[PDB]
């Protein structure tokens, strides 16, 4: 098992391709304020051409997620945030 | 392991049969809200005869929920909303 | 692993026996509200002739608290709702 | 695995002390109130000489934690209520 | 599986080194307040070249965090407070 997380800026999806044979656990989203807002954060992943929402952060109810999120193959995170990025946390294992 | 997740809409119940030997585990379930509402999202899931809450959501207050479930025979899948979605996520795994 | 789960209801007992060589997991407390309260709902688990209180819900505030509670023997659910029944859910496995 | 819990009182420190070549999962602390308060409850644990605080609890925000923590040696559980009792619940398990 | 924490403090970074062929998990994260402020305590990881977010904390909001985080190498935590330090909690394992 080893160390994995991205930063997901707004308007712009991050693709993650786990390796042949193994997986990518996501276990927490978290809230990187860039100006003060309101704002709901709107979390989705997209998986083989399905787009589910996988939470709604904000700065002030709901700065973080914890999860166990499991992904065998290519998916990409994004979210509907204009004022924060969201920082995405877990790990790779073997699968 | 692989990913699983459904999208379960107003009115109508998702049935999701786990493959022989195998199990569906539900991490989160997240509103994918349609309209702006304070209403009170209670979500179930039928196993048998039997149909039990397995939480309540809501947009302002509750907007997801993270849960170590499990699955080894059908199951069915339905909420009380009717102004949001109910996104379910989780994994697939033997067992 | 199989699904598990049970509704307690105001004023009674639950008693869970899990078999020989067996746990019983369980991984959320949900209310199923009956009529419209804030009462604090007191959930309660006897193992062996000790009480322990595992929460308080509340229609509010708390509607659900996520476990990782594990049962090797028989044990009792009790609350203190009168206005909501609480329902358990998890997952029996091997012990 | 085994059904594990205990009930910490005002003022009295719990010593607890693992299975030899076992562990504690310790997987909630939720209040058992005793008279109506806002106290802030705050729980510590010590191992080996260091104590750390694994969270805070009140009665009318924060009444339980869930927890993932494990102890393989013997540990203390403190809090400072003084208008609550807390109890833990989790489980021993093997740890070899 | 063995108990491991640490207590980190404002303006102060702390290194972490697991074991080869070992891993630091955490669990939680929780203010020990120094004095009374409703500051939003924003917690890092440097893992490497990457830095990220890993929740936010407060006295009266967001006092702990429960997290399913994992470190195979060398890291270092740290946070924006000044009126708290914070623990991490978890264990450490072989990987
Ligand atoms: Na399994």
């Known amino acids: ?23 990518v656990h996501i276990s927490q989203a978290s809230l990187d304020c ?11 992943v997209t998986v083989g051409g399905a787009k ?5 952060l904000s700065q002030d109810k709901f700065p973080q997620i914890s999860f166990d999120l499991v992904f065998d193959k290519e998916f990409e995170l994004s979210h509907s945030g204009t004022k924060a990025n969201v920082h995405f946390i877990g790990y790779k294992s073997p699968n």
Request: proline fraction near 5%; aromatic fraction near 6%.
């Open 1 to 23: 098992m080893e160390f994995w997380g991205v930063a997901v800026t707004p308007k712009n999806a991050t693709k993650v391709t786990p390796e042949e044979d193994s997986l």
């Open 34 to 44: 860039t100006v003060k807002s309101g704002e709901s954060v709107v979390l989705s």
């Open 52 to 56: 589910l929402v996988i939470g709604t």
